[PDB]
Amino acid sequence: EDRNVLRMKERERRNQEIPLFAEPYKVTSKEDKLSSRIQSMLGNYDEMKDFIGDR
Amino acid sequence: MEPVDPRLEPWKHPGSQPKTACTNCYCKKCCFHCQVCFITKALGISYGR
Amino acid sequence: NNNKRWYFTREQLENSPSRRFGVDPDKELSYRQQAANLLQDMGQRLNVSQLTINTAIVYMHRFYMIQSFTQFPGNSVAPAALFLAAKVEEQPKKLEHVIKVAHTCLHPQESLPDTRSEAYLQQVQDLVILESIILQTLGFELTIDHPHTHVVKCTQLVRASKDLAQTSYFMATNSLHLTTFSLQYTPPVVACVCIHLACKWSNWEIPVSTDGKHWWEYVDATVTLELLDELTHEFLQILEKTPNRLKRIWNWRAC
Amino acid sequence: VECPFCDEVSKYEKLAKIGQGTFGEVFKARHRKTGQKVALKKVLMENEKEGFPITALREIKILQLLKHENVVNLIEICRTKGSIYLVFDFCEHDLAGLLSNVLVKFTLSEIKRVMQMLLNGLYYIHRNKILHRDMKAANVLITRDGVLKLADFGLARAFSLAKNSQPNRYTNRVVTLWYRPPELLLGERDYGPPIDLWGAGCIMAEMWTRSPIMQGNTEQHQLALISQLCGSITPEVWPNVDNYELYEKLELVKGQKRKVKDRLKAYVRDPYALDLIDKLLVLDPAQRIDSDDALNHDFFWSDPMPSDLKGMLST
Ligand SMILES: Nc1ncnc2c1ncn2[C@@H]1O[C@H](CO)[C@@H](O)[C@H]1O
Ligand SMILES: [Zn+2]
Ligand SMILES: [Zn+2]
């Protein structure tokens, strides 16, 4: 009933309208069919990695 | 080719034009010169005849 | 169900407006890729953001789920889409400039038409018209979300190396150029596929989080390893069907 | 030429012209079958020099995002069998019109409510990273039920809190000259929400003067009027204003003292009202009051409390 309260209640109504992972590592084996495929088609990643992007 | 921080505002994003002009060389470096070169040279896709 | 408007089933993609006019699936997909390539080229000459190009590409993909390549050539639609995207993504280019760049790309032989010539003002009229047609075709839904946003955000979270960050982002661009994933799966899903593909290629492995959840769970709650493998599969399938069918055509020589 | 996601404007019947927008003509119309009233804002593609206006594109983008009780509502976008029409929910009145209407009389209570709704709207769009950039009485609509609506976002845009680093270079010559703040006239391009609140001050003064308080004809004239009313623009009252390239290139009167309350005293009378206007028309935007502080100002929580407009509007 008081202004201070009625004021604050309105301030809030206003307002209410608005390391997880370890560092990734290389994996030599085991190999899965998906990876094996990809590498056979795109080739060797490390041979390409310095051409994709900036140095 | 090169990542861009999405948190940048649209008018802040860098231009896509590569620093060097596209060539007609088909060496490894030139086939991965830029997105256009990769799509056209390495993957053989063209809009022109 | 306003989301599923610009997202389609394979039955819908198979029954494209272009299929309706007798255009082979592989040939339509080709027309899309060429338009994407053209958008990318022009965009790079105009020196707009990749965001602009990406938005222009999604417009194109969506445009041709309503209109047919029979009726609207990619080489006429593309400059209009890029011109529009340039404004939407707050890096607008003068109409004169776009027609210039478009001419360079599609007619390297011809001379750049005079700005006073009747033929030049005709080029202007066509572009401005197409822009109006693109706008109406899309229902003025011009706000596009891209995989690149989620890809970059995710690589930061998982502490990827520059090469892995670069490659994931690179595959995101390739997804727009070479596939119709933008019409099938939401940007977060596509972002995972790209990261997943970059990892399988590079042999980088992203472990499980400190709270026991896979990395894609922090990108989209609907994604599962079954889906990722299956879509990476489809992505590779599209890559093979490209001309030069992936064969390494470079020369191991100087310049 | 298929077009499933863009209905023909034929579904509406134009009733009358109702002013000129940022980029078009505006018409009142009613839906032919249901009688629902709307405002059709016609995109005037006379300017085929740059195709569809980026100005209109921003409005469409922004209003698809913004949804608030004190922001005007975009319904759809329609075509002609062509020209494009933006379709808004119709509002019976606009604040400029009401203030010009001699038969319309505001109680203090009703003025408080108008300013409350206005600043509530500004508070919302600002927290959603949107600048209106055209605050003026004519762009403030009020419905039959006395609900204020910010309108005409043709001049609006998104802005950044970027980034403790490279600053933004927004468009400088924006906001109608009369309601344009000092920093814009001095060529600021890295501005923010304060420019809208300068306008709010200008509008709040109009609630009592019934006439725009600074009607300049040029940017220099406007600056002169501001100096006369708000005091001379000096580093003492506005730190680092020196740094504006045009601060000395324009030659600004140095003697003027601040006369905001002095000149508005006779018209406004209410003490709190005068104070709030005084805080809104601060020269230095860094020191100018913001939406949140303004909305907590005693003006809005002292007697007489704000009341609904519905009463006054039926006359
Ligand atoms: N829904 C509306 N009702 C009344 N006037 C409007 C409406 N929309 C725009 N206007 C008028 O259009 C002009 C600005 O676009 C102003 O004169 C404003 O009053
Ligand atoms: Zn290149
Ligand atoms: Zn070379």
XYZ file of C-alpha atoms and ligand atoms in Angstrom:
695
model
C 0.000 0.000 0.000
C 2.973 2.303 0.615
C 4.583 4.231 -2.246
C 8.060 2.784 -1.681
C 6.622 -0.704 -2.068
C 4.332 0.200 -4.966
C 7.385 1.826 -6.552
C 9.655 -1.180 -6.092
C 6.998 -3.654 -7.217
C 6.908 -1.637 -10.451
C 10.689 -1.489 -10.773
C 10.730 -5.280 -10.830
C 7.755 -5.692 -13.182
C 9.756 -3.492 -15.534
C 12.774 -5.722 -15.115
C 11.144 -9.154 -15.474
C 10.244 -8.285 -19.079
C 13.923 -8.644 -20.001
C 36.280 -25.104 -17.343
C 33.780 -27.774 -18.435
C 35.962 -29.603 -20.948
C 39.481 -30.986 -21.003
C 41.826 -29.933 -23.774
C 41.083 -32.121 -26.834
C 43.624 -34.831 -27.709
C 44.712 -36.827 -30.762
C 43.366 -40.345 -31.274
C 45.403 -42.830 -33.294
C 43.261 -45.848 -32.491
C 40.715 -47.200 -32.267
C 39.515 -46.128 -35.705
C 35.856 -46.049 -36.735
C 34.411 -46.473 -40.231
C 33.336 -42.820 -40.424
C 36.811 -41.399 -39.777
C 38.497 -43.958 -42.040
C 36.131 -42.969 -44.831
C 36.636 -39.197 -44.390
C 40.430 -39.485 -44.401
C 40.350 -41.573 -47.591
C 38.319 -38.842 -49.302
C 39.616 -35.518 -47.947
C 43.116 -36.926 -47.483
C 45.512 -36.213 -44.627
C 44.288 -33.442 -42.336
C 47.677 -32.208 -41.118
C 48.757 -31.700 -44.731
C 45.803 -29.314 -45.165
C 45.256 -27.667 -41.776
C 47.676 -24.804 -42.487
C 45.836 -23.973 -45.725
C 42.410 -23.736 -44.118
C 42.315 -20.382 -42.328
C 44.971 -17.799 -41.497
C 48.481 -18.146 -40.091
C 37.625 -19.948 -44.247
C 38.629 -17.895 -41.203
C 36.412 -17.880 -38.072
C 34.687 -14.692 -36.871
C 33.543 -14.002 -33.311
C 29.735 -14.154 -33.530
C 29.488 -11.808 -30.560
C 30.587 -9.051 -32.936
C 27.766 -6.829 -34.137
C 26.882 -7.281 -37.832
C 28.382 -3.918 -38.819
C 31.602 -4.943 -37.031
C 32.282 -8.127 -39.008
C 35.411 -8.030 -41.207
C 35.042 -8.064 -44.991
C 35.366 -11.346 -46.865
C 37.733 -10.039 -49.544
C 41.071 -11.880 -49.340
C 44.249 -9.820 -48.918
C 45.658 -11.157 -52.196
C 43.964 -11.386 -55.598
C 42.715 -14.746 -56.872
C 45.088 -16.366 -59.360
C 44.835 -19.080 -62.015
C 47.559 -21.230 -60.447
C 46.345 -24.642 -59.279
C 49.010 -25.291 -56.651
C 47.894 -26.405 -53.180
C 48.192 -22.871 -51.750
C 46.081 -21.363 -54.537
C 43.368 -24.029 -54.389
C 42.846 -23.091 -50.730
C 43.389 -19.369 -51.292
C 39.812 -18.580 -50.322
C 36.302 -20.023 -50.274
C 35.758 -19.135 -53.929
C 38.988 -20.812 -55.021
C 38.280 -23.942 -52.987
C 34.765 -24.329 -54.362
C 35.771 -23.590 -57.964
C 39.293 -24.996 -58.252
C 39.403 -27.867 -55.745
C 35.771 -28.983 -56.112
C 35.258 -27.916 -59.732
C 32.040 -25.914 -59.215
C 31.414 -22.889 -61.444
C 28.473 -20.624 -62.283
C 30.056 -19.510 -65.548
C 30.515 -21.749 -68.583
C 4.288 -24.372 -36.445
C 5.779 -21.262 -38.063
C 9.295 -22.656 -37.658
C 8.565 -25.663 -39.867
C 7.674 -23.173 -42.619
C 11.253 -22.754 -43.839
C 12.163 -26.297 -42.823
C 11.226 -29.146 -45.119
C 10.940 -32.912 -45.299
C 12.766 -34.921 -47.957
C 9.425 -35.457 -49.692
C 9.120 -31.673 -49.979
C 12.692 -31.221 -51.178
C 12.147 -34.024 -53.686
C 9.002 -32.231 -54.881
C 10.633 -28.854 -55.428
C 9.093 -26.135 -57.611
C 11.954 -26.984 -59.973
C 11.118 -30.698 -59.954
C 7.621 -29.589 -60.902
C 9.104 -28.131 -64.093
C 11.253 -31.185 -64.815
C 14.636 -30.503 -63.238
C 16.678 -33.462 -61.981
C 17.447 -33.514 -58.218
C 21.209 -33.544 -58.826
C 20.809 -30.790 -61.410
C 18.773 -28.574 -59.087
C 21.284 -29.144 -56.300
C 23.939 -28.114 -58.810
C 22.081 -24.877 -59.605
C 22.013 -24.113 -55.874
C 25.754 -24.701 -55.487
C 26.527 -22.464 -58.455
C 24.376 -19.672 -57.013
C 26.156 -20.089 -53.680
C 29.519 -19.910 -55.427
C 28.396 -16.828 -57.347
C 27.147 -15.199 -54.147
C 30.479 -15.939 -52.488
C 32.493 -14.529 -55.388
C 30.475 -11.303 -55.689
C 30.450 -10.904 -51.915
C 34.222 -11.166 -51.782
C 34.608 -8.564 -54.534
C 32.202 -6.237 -52.752
C 34.136 -7.015 -49.565
C 31.083 -7.705 -47.415
C 31.145 -9.858 -44.287
C 30.899 -13.640 -44.591
C 27.736 -13.193 -42.534
C 26.248 -11.205 -45.418
C 27.178 -13.915 -47.913
C 25.824 -16.644 -45.643
C 22.532 -14.777 -45.221
C 22.321 -14.282 -48.981
C 22.858 -18.020 -49.479
C 20.052 -18.962 -47.082
C 17.733 -16.538 -48.875
C 18.578 -18.278 -52.141
C 17.951 -21.736 -50.672
C 14.584 -20.598 -49.333
C 13.703 -18.691 -52.497
C 13.880 -21.909 -54.513
C 11.571 -23.812 -52.184
C 8.839 -21.552 -53.590
C 10.132 -20.454 -57.002
C 11.671 -22.593 -59.757
C 15.060 -22.289 -61.447
C 13.078 -22.569 -64.686
C 11.436 -19.229 -64.001
C 14.232 -17.513 -62.059
C 17.868 -18.113 -63.082
C 20.388 -18.295 -60.238
C 22.617 -15.749 -61.971
C 19.809 -13.176 -61.909
C 18.507 -13.958 -58.423
C 21.943 -14.061 -56.786
C 22.894 -10.382 -57.188
C 19.480 -9.347 -55.852
C 19.789 -11.637 -52.823
C 23.284 -10.376 -51.997
C 22.199 -6.757 -52.462
C 19.360 -7.405 -50.020
C 21.480 -9.349 -47.535
C 24.053 -6.546 -47.550
C 21.434 -4.183 -46.115
C 19.976 -6.652 -43.621
C 23.413 -7.454 -42.187
C 24.292 -3.754 -41.891
C 26.985 -3.585 -44.562
C 24.949 -2.178 -47.471
C 26.514 -1.733 -50.903
C 25.523 0.784 -53.561
C 23.307 -0.687 -56.272
C 25.724 0.620 -58.908
C 28.553 -1.287 -57.206
C 26.669 -4.608 -57.148
C 25.684 -4.470 -60.834
C 29.340 -3.762 -61.610
C 30.635 -6.734 -59.623
C 27.894 -8.975 -61.016
C 28.844 -8.007 -64.559
C 32.527 -8.745 -63.933
C 31.605 -12.211 -62.685
C 29.106 -13.199 -65.383
C 30.621 -11.337 -68.354
C 34.412 -11.040 -68.050
C 34.502 -10.585 -71.832
C 31.940 -7.788 -72.229
C 32.747 -4.203 -71.269
C 31.074 -2.711 -68.185
C 27.909 -1.042 -69.555
C 27.634 2.751 -69.504
C 25.757 4.169 -66.502
C 23.573 6.170 -68.908
C 22.824 3.411 -71.419
C 19.261 2.138 -71.759
C 20.655 -1.360 -71.244
C 22.236 -0.411 -67.914
C 19.053 1.090 -66.471
C 17.373 -2.148 -67.525
C 19.830 -4.128 -65.386
C 18.929 -1.839 -62.473
C 15.189 -2.348 -62.954
C 15.619 -6.136 -62.987
C 17.669 -6.187 -59.783
C 15.306 -3.912 -57.872
C 12.355 -6.001 -59.073
C 13.963 -9.314 -58.069
C 14.734 -7.854 -54.638
C 11.030 -7.108 -54.265
C 10.184 -10.638 -55.427
C 12.723 -12.232 -53.072
C 11.306 -10.180 -50.195
C 7.726 -11.193 -50.932
C 8.650 -14.829 -51.576
C 10.326 -15.013 -48.166
C 7.381 -13.321 -46.466
C 9.763 -10.620 -45.257
C 11.300 -13.094 -42.822
C 14.817 -11.682 -43.110
C 16.405 -12.697 -39.794
C 18.664 -15.691 -40.405
C 20.597 -17.745 -37.863
C 23.731 -19.512 -39.124
C 25.733 -22.568 -37.969
C 28.861 -20.418 -37.751
C 27.554 -18.686 -34.632
C 27.094 -21.955 -32.770
C 30.248 -23.533 -34.206
C 32.506 -20.745 -32.945
C 30.770 -20.581 -29.568
C 31.145 -24.348 -29.147
C 34.836 -24.545 -30.096
C 35.601 -21.955 -27.411
C 33.754 -24.046 -24.840
C 35.583 -27.273 -25.696
C 38.952 -25.484 -25.887
C 39.693 -26.458 -29.490
C 42.932 -25.544 -31.256
C 43.062 -22.857 -33.962
C 43.133 -25.477 -36.703
C 40.102 -27.295 -35.301
C 38.285 -23.993 -34.856
C 39.243 -22.989 -38.400
C 38.203 -26.329 -39.896
C 34.852 -26.503 -38.087
C 34.026 -22.989 -39.260
C 35.234 -23.925 -42.752
C 32.896 -26.931 -42.872
C 30.033 -24.639 -41.819
C 30.543 -22.510 -44.918
C 30.829 -25.653 -47.051
C 27.517 -26.876 -45.649
C 25.774 -23.778 -47.004
C 27.515 -24.013 -50.364
C 27.219 -27.725 -51.034
C 24.104 -28.914 -49.169
C 20.500 -28.036 -48.340
C 20.936 -28.544 -44.590
C 19.803 -24.950 -44.035
C 16.400 -26.171 -45.256
C 16.405 -29.424 -43.253
C 18.103 -28.941 -39.879
C 18.417 -25.982 -37.514
C 21.738 -24.085 -37.313
C 22.750 -25.663 -33.977
C 22.311 -29.166 -35.410
C 24.347 -28.283 -38.497
C 27.014 -26.733 -36.278
C 27.497 -30.061 -34.494
C 27.710 -32.000 -37.759
C 30.445 -29.628 -38.892
C 32.419 -29.983 -35.652
C 31.808 -33.734 -35.676
C 33.143 -33.956 -39.229
C 36.180 -31.792 -38.481
C 37.015 -34.027 -35.518
C 36.734 -37.324 -37.391
C 38.984 -35.910 -40.113
C 41.625 -34.377 -37.829
C 41.558 -37.190 -35.246
C 41.068 -34.526 -32.599
C 38.784 -35.964 -29.916
C 36.511 -33.930 -27.664
C 35.991 -35.707 -24.342
C 32.919 -35.712 -22.118
C 32.416 -32.702 -19.831
C 33.138 -32.541 -16.108
C 29.405 -33.180 -15.625
C 29.356 -36.269 -17.834
C 27.698 -34.856 -20.968
C 28.844 -34.943 -24.599
C 29.869 -31.667 -26.222
C 26.878 -31.514 -28.590
C 24.561 -31.544 -25.563
C 25.839 -28.024 -24.864
C 24.859 -26.957 -28.393
C 21.475 -28.594 -28.962
C 19.354 -30.841 -26.757
C 17.922 -32.854 -29.670
C 21.247 -33.942 -31.170
C 22.502 -37.485 -30.656
C 25.562 -39.393 -31.868
C 23.299 -41.479 -34.114
C 22.128 -38.336 -35.898
C 25.617 -36.852 -36.182
C 27.152 -39.943 -37.784
C 24.226 -40.189 -40.198
C 24.448 -36.534 -41.264
C 28.231 -36.525 -41.529
C 27.643 -39.508 -43.798
C 25.215 -37.529 -45.957
C 27.598 -34.562 -45.989
C 30.428 -36.733 -47.314
C 28.043 -38.254 -49.858
C 27.359 -34.782 -51.226
C 31.084 -34.047 -51.293
C 31.817 -37.049 -53.515
C 29.136 -36.097 -56.035
C 30.781 -32.721 -56.628
C 32.670 -32.481 -59.887
C 36.394 -33.291 -59.624
C 34.878 -35.908 -57.248
C 37.295 -34.940 -54.434
C 40.406 -35.975 -56.429
C 43.508 -33.922 -55.554
C 44.081 -31.872 -58.712
C 46.930 -29.612 -57.512
C 50.459 -29.875 -58.949
C 53.097 -30.009 -56.195
C 54.891 -27.278 -58.179
C 55.766 -23.593 -57.806
C 53.448 -20.912 -59.279
C 4.310 -15.906 -59.928
C 3.566 -17.721 -56.652
C 3.695 -15.795 -53.376
C 2.023 -17.696 -50.487
C 3.473 -15.699 -47.564
C 2.369 -12.203 -48.562
C -1.363 -11.499 -48.626
C -2.852 -8.832 -50.876
C -3.645 -5.515 -49.193
C -7.088 -5.788 -50.849
C -8.303 -7.454 -47.646
C -8.261 -3.959 -46.134
C -10.311 -0.934 -47.200
C -8.520 2.419 -47.051
C -10.573 5.025 -45.190
C -8.309 8.085 -45.101
C -4.772 9.455 -45.269
C -3.235 10.025 -41.837
C 0.197 11.586 -42.381
C 3.605 10.996 -43.957
C 5.969 8.396 -42.496
C 9.743 7.925 -42.549
C 9.511 6.386 -46.019
C 5.844 6.363 -46.987
C 2.242 7.472 -46.906
C 0.118 6.215 -44.017
C -3.567 5.295 -44.309
C -6.253 4.288 -41.849
C -8.075 1.191 -43.100
C -10.514 -1.440 -41.824
C -10.588 -5.149 -42.598
C -13.403 -5.697 -45.080
C -14.980 -8.691 -43.328
C -14.211 -8.185 -39.613
C -13.984 -4.393 -39.500
C -10.651 -4.550 -37.684
C -8.826 -1.227 -38.027
C -5.200 -1.056 -39.137
C -2.646 1.491 -40.312
C -1.198 0.831 -43.772
C 2.241 2.383 -44.160
C 3.103 2.284 -47.866
C 6.724 1.702 -48.839
C 7.294 4.380 -51.467
C 9.700 2.821 -53.953
C 10.186 6.123 -55.754
C 13.743 5.791 -54.555
C 14.670 2.853 -56.772
C 18.203 4.233 -56.542
C 18.945 1.810 -53.698
C 16.001 -0.568 -54.069
C 13.959 -1.466 -50.995
C 14.881 1.108 -48.343
C 17.218 -0.203 -45.635
C 15.296 2.211 -43.432
C 12.126 0.150 -43.947
C 14.041 -3.124 -43.623
C 15.223 -2.134 -40.153
C 11.677 -1.295 -39.026
C 10.371 -4.672 -40.192
C 13.250 -6.557 -38.566
C 13.011 -4.621 -35.305
C 9.228 -4.782 -34.863
C 9.204 -8.523 -35.507
C 11.496 -8.693 -32.473
C 10.018 -6.070 -30.145
C 6.756 -6.953 -28.437
C 5.610 -4.646 -25.652
C 2.452 -2.889 -24.468
C 3.973 0.521 -25.224
C 5.466 -0.368 -28.607
C 3.317 -0.219 -31.748
C 2.402 -3.588 -33.227
C 3.269 -4.844 -36.698
C 0.619 -7.287 -37.949
C 1.827 -8.291 -41.392
C 3.220 -7.049 -44.697
C 0.998 -6.828 -47.757
C 1.441 -6.266 -51.493
C -0.485 -5.000 -54.514
C -1.230 -6.988 -57.676
C 4.026 -3.651 -57.079
C 3.992 -1.615 -53.865
C 4.443 -2.922 -50.313
C 2.345 -2.031 -47.262
C 3.364 -2.404 -43.618
C 0.239 -3.288 -41.613
C 0.060 -2.005 -38.024
C -2.567 -2.139 -35.300
C -4.432 1.168 -35.506
C -4.368 3.823 -32.761
C -7.090 6.458 -32.530
C -4.794 9.323 -31.480
C -1.249 10.626 -31.720
C 0.207 12.818 -28.988
C 1.045 15.709 -31.315
C -2.551 15.851 -32.531
C -3.942 15.818 -28.998
C -1.650 18.616 -27.863
C -2.734 20.729 -30.851
C -6.386 19.995 -30.171
C -7.739 22.823 -28.068
C -10.623 20.754 -26.706
C -8.202 18.248 -25.152
C -7.260 19.092 -21.556
C -4.731 17.111 -19.486
C -4.854 16.813 -15.707
C -1.459 16.519 -13.998
C -2.346 12.934 -13.157
C -2.893 12.131 -16.830
C 0.387 13.732 -17.918
C 2.236 11.600 -15.372
C 0.647 8.512 -16.900
C 1.597 9.515 -20.438
C 5.229 10.094 -19.482
C 5.204 6.871 -17.461
C 4.071 4.787 -20.441
C 6.499 6.608 -22.734
C 9.545 5.977 -20.558
C 8.367 2.401 -19.973
C 8.425 1.895 -23.725
C 11.821 3.536 -24.076
C 13.117 1.433 -21.204
C 12.032 -1.721 -23.016
C 13.450 -1.005 -26.464
C 16.738 0.203 -24.980
C 17.265 -2.970 -22.955
C 16.643 -4.875 -26.193
C 19.491 -2.899 -27.769
C 17.313 -0.686 -29.986
C 17.515 3.084 -30.485
C 14.348 4.826 -31.673
C 16.199 7.878 -33.018
C 13.057 9.908 -33.772
C 11.336 10.744 -30.494
C 8.717 13.399 -31.121
C 5.076 13.966 -30.180
C 3.888 12.890 -33.631
C 5.561 9.471 -33.239
C 3.751 8.777 -29.968
C 0.374 7.102 -30.501
C -2.427 6.579 -27.984
C -5.237 4.060 -28.443
C -8.912 4.566 -27.563
C -8.300 2.837 -24.237
C -5.559 5.325 -23.379
C -2.562 3.074 -24.032
C 0.518 4.902 -25.306
C 2.493 3.359 -28.186
C 5.931 4.296 -29.503
C 5.715 4.235 -33.296
C 7.465 4.808 -36.622
C 10.629 2.747 -36.135
C 11.700 3.646 -39.672
C 14.613 5.560 -38.151
C 15.431 2.945 -35.508
C 18.445 0.629 -35.378
C 20.296 -1.828 -33.162
C 23.248 -0.572 -31.133
C 26.196 -1.990 -29.226
C 27.873 -1.861 -25.831
C 31.113 -2.382 -27.713
C 33.635 -3.271 -26.402
C 35.877 -1.234 -24.128
C 37.458 -0.965 -27.575
C 36.764 0.142 -31.180
C 33.766 2.488 -30.998
C 30.735 2.466 -33.306
C 30.228 4.929 -36.167
C 26.431 5.156 -36.320
C 24.569 7.601 -38.563
C 24.956 11.111 -37.150
C 22.207 13.186 -38.764
C 19.261 11.383 -37.163
C 16.307 12.415 -34.976
C 14.046 15.255 -36.099
C 16.049 18.462 -35.667
C 13.806 19.993 -33.002
C 14.151 16.910 -30.790
C 17.791 16.222 -31.653
C 20.210 16.207 -28.686
C 23.443 18.284 -28.421
C 25.928 15.433 -28.944
C 24.435 14.599 -32.351
C 24.646 18.245 -33.400
C 28.327 18.189 -32.402
C 28.808 15.207 -34.714
C 28.778 12.287 -32.273
C 28.595 8.905 -34.028
C 29.195 6.688 -30.975
C 25.988 7.605 -29.146
C 23.384 5.509 -27.336
C 20.011 5.454 -25.502
C 20.453 8.980 -24.055
C 19.501 10.549 -27.420
C 15.994 9.152 -27.053
C 15.701 10.478 -23.510
C 16.605 13.974 -24.676
C 13.523 13.695 -26.874
C 11.509 12.440 -23.909
C 12.439 15.652 -22.110
C 11.438 17.735 -25.120
C 8.119 15.886 -25.304
C 7.534 16.159 -21.562
C 7.893 19.933 -21.763
C 5.366 19.958 -24.613
C 2.772 18.372 -22.341
C 2.448 21.809 -20.721
C 3.642 24.231 -23.422
C 1.464 22.587 -26.090
C 4.190 23.621 -28.543
C 7.727 22.301 -29.291
C 10.167 24.152 -27.035
C 13.116 24.484 -29.454
C 12.129 24.910 -33.104
C 15.420 25.426 -34.943
C 15.775 25.682 -38.729
C 19.394 24.557 -38.975
C 21.744 22.461 -36.851
C 23.497 25.622 -35.662
C 20.194 27.366 -34.918
C 19.033 24.340 -32.938
C 22.330 24.356 -31.043
C 21.881 28.049 -30.293
C 18.366 27.492 -28.955
C 19.673 24.650 -26.783
C 22.480 26.841 -25.450
C 20.045 29.639 -24.583
C 17.756 27.232 -22.736
C 20.093 24.619 -21.258
C 23.121 26.850 -20.714
C 26.344 27.277 -22.650
C 28.129 24.141 -23.835
C 31.406 24.049 -21.909
C 33.936 21.470 -20.611
C 32.995 22.610 -17.108
C 29.452 21.288 -17.541
C 30.301 18.690 -20.208
C 33.764 17.075 -19.787
C 35.675 16.267 -22.992
C 33.218 18.143 -25.209
C 36.458 19.798 -26.385
C 37.264 16.633 -28.280
C 34.479 17.160 -30.808
C 36.107 18.245 -34.061
C 33.334 20.818 -34.563
C 33.239 22.184 -30.992
C 35.309 25.252 -31.967
C 34.491 25.122 -35.685
C 30.930 26.227 -34.827
C 31.534 29.041 -32.314
C 29.175 28.633 -29.354
C 27.842 31.418 -27.146
C 29.662 31.278 -23.803
C 27.666 33.540 -21.494
C 24.336 31.707 -21.339
C 23.310 30.299 -17.948
C 20.890 27.387 -17.580
C 17.255 28.529 -17.782
C 15.349 25.249 -18.143
C 13.299 25.641 -14.975
C 13.141 29.427 -15.348
C 11.420 29.274 -18.741
C 9.187 26.272 -18.050
C 8.258 27.322 -14.496
C 5.281 29.417 -15.631
C 3.865 26.649 -17.851
C 4.600 23.468 -15.882
C 4.292 24.687 -12.263
C 4.668 21.224 -10.683
C 8.009 21.038 -8.821
C 8.761 17.351 -9.451
C 7.760 17.719 -13.101
C 10.234 20.576 -13.516
C 12.977 18.548 -11.847
C 12.473 15.524 -14.094
C 12.492 17.714 -17.215
C 15.656 19.320 -15.873
C 17.368 15.928 -15.573
C 16.205 14.876 -19.037
C 17.588 17.955 -20.805
C 21.082 17.644 -19.354
C 23.675 18.516 -21.993
C 26.236 15.804 -21.271
C 24.588 12.487 -22.185
C 26.808 10.763 -19.621
C 25.062 12.821 -16.931
C 21.597 12.795 -18.497
C 19.059 10.738 -16.532
C 18.217 7.252 -17.854
C 14.863 5.469 -18.246
C 15.173 3.453 -15.044
C 16.122 6.372 -12.807
C 13.476 8.520 -14.491
C 10.745 5.947 -13.896
C 11.635 5.836 -10.186
C 11.610 9.645 -9.900
C 9.242 11.116 -7.286
C 7.189 12.678 -10.085
C 5.648 9.236 -10.687
C 5.142 8.177 -7.054
C 3.959 11.391 -5.408
C 0.399 12.712 -5.232
C -1.503 12.923 -7.445
C -0.633 9.411 -8.631
C -0.908 8.711 -12.369
C -4.396 7.871 -13.673
C -5.871 6.279 -16.778
C -6.336 8.466 -19.855
C -9.630 6.915 -21.046
C -11.529 9.674 -19.248
C -9.956 12.709 -20.910
C -9.866 11.117 -24.377
C -13.639 10.874 -24.906
C -13.771 14.678 -25.285
N -2.011 3.987 -36.186
C -1.929 5.429 -36.374
N -2.905 6.230 -35.932
C -2.845 7.554 -36.093
N -1.814 8.147 -36.701
C -0.799 7.421 -37.171
C -0.827 5.995 -37.017
N 0.336 5.538 -37.592
C 1.009 6.605 -38.056
N 0.319 7.647 -37.793
C 0.757 8.997 -38.155
O 1.798 8.886 -39.106
C 2.770 9.947 -38.895
C 4.137 9.335 -38.701
O 4.287 8.131 -39.449
C 2.253 10.772 -37.715
O 1.479 11.868 -38.201
C 1.341 9.789 -36.990
O 0.330 10.392 -36.212
Zn 40.756 -16.884 -54.148
Zn 50.170 -20.594 -56.771
